[PDB]
Amino acid sequence: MATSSEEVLLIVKKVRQKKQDGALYLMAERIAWAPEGKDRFTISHMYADIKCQKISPEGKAKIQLQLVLHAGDTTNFHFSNESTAVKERDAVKDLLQQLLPKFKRKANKELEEKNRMLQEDPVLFQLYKDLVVSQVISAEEFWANRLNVNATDSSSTS
DSSP states (O other), rough: OOOOOOOOOEEEEEEEETTTTEEEESSSEEEEEETOOOOOSSEETTTEEEEEEOOOOOOSEEEEEEEEEEEEEEEEEEEETTTTTTHHHHHHHHHHHHHTTOOOOOOOOOHHHHHHHHHHHHHHHHHHHIIIITTSSHHHHHHHHHHHHHHHHHHHOO
């Protein structure tokens, strides 16, 4: 069956994400953040999905952590816990960086360029939902003429 080894490895608190501070819990196989007062992780990424981690420059009153997922995503966190914020992001950066290679999945650059194109060109992503979502054509059909040319002028067409 699906063995969910939910092993909380680190307990981090006072982390503002999505304009709401909470608690970020690390697990053997993933990272999950919950808002303060809620037992619900509104953020849960598997190390296999997280490519790397970025942290804000030290000596600042803003402990910010930013993970980047292989799909071409990310995970930004604001450790507002002035008491251990820095150390929390540190042990976090370290712990994740420990389990991250443990679950290091293949870098899907094929997907990265796709995701990044959908973020850059709002029209491209619009037509994507228009055609590919309406089952008008497959995703690669649209991508075929877009991956080779990323320009909103051309994105106005298939």
